[PDB]
Amino acid sequence: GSHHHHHHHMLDVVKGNLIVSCQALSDEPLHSSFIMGRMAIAAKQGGAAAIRAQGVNDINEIKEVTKLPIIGIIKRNYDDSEIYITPTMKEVDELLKTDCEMIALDATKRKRPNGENVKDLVDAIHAKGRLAMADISTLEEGIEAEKLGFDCVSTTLSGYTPYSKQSNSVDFELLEELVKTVKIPVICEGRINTPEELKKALDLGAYSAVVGGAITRPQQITKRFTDIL
């Protein structure tokens, strides 16, 4: 198979720039592809180079109204797994029905639903010419992500698995250690609240960074303000 060559490519475009996650799950006040589309427009107009989005309907709305590169995931609980970020081939195939250029998935060491292997998911993604991001919680998971064929790794799940570093602030340590040890792009994702933290992450060698809640979750932004009173 063949297709036409584009001038701009996702990894080149996010390099040293900000990716904005526009996510609002079913228990959140902005749950609606209409609203997540408006959030992406705002992120675009504020200088975001790419968007991270959850669910086929949000992804498709964001792509239409922004034309930005997208990192797509589907979050879904399964009874037989702790994994919820794009846990199976069923979610991978749903995401490949969208135009999102990259698909992130949980690349932790943990057991996946139906006893599926991460390599198969990663191979399915590459088979359709997409990119694969490995959301990880620890340094070894990141090191293994590279070996599995991932195009890039993200610290998304650090502090969100029981065996990774438990923290309320950005895991800069993980970032540094990934940078010493993998060749592929290391993206810093998780609990970036301020411009200073974002600069620090890129200063520490992050290829790019994702900021979600501190831009697109007004409830969380509000809480951070009211917590200080």
| Chain residues in the site for Cl ion (CB under 5 A) | 29, 42, 217-219
Separation between Cα atoms, residue 228 and residue 45, nearest integer Å: 30
In the complex with ligand RFW, the residue whose CB is nearer, 58 or 146, is 58
> What single-letter amino acid sits at 29?
P
| Contact letters for ligand RFW, residues 198-227 (x by CB under 6 A) | ------------xxxxx-------------
- Residue 226 vs residues 220, 221, 222, 229: alpha-carbon distances, Å: 10, 9, 6, 5
Q: Which does 196 bind (CB under 5 to 8 A by kind): Cl ion, its own copies, ligand RFW, none?
A: its own copies
Separation between Cα atoms, residue 50 and residue 67, nearest integer Å: 9
113 and 63 Cβ atoms separated by less than 8 Å: no
> What single-letter amino acid sits at 32?
S
* Residue 14 contacts ligand RFW per CB under 6 A: no
Q: Please, what is the minimum distance in Å from the beta carbon of residue 37 to its own copies? A: 9
In the complex with ligand RFW, the residue whose CB is nearer, 47 or 127, is 47
- Select from 10, 20, 68, 92 the one that contacts its own copies (CB under 8 A): 20
Q: Which does 195 bind (CB under 5 to 8 A by kind): ligand RFW, its own copies, Cl ion, none?
A: its own copies
Which residue from 85, 74, 92 is spatially nearest to 110, judged by alpha carbons?
85
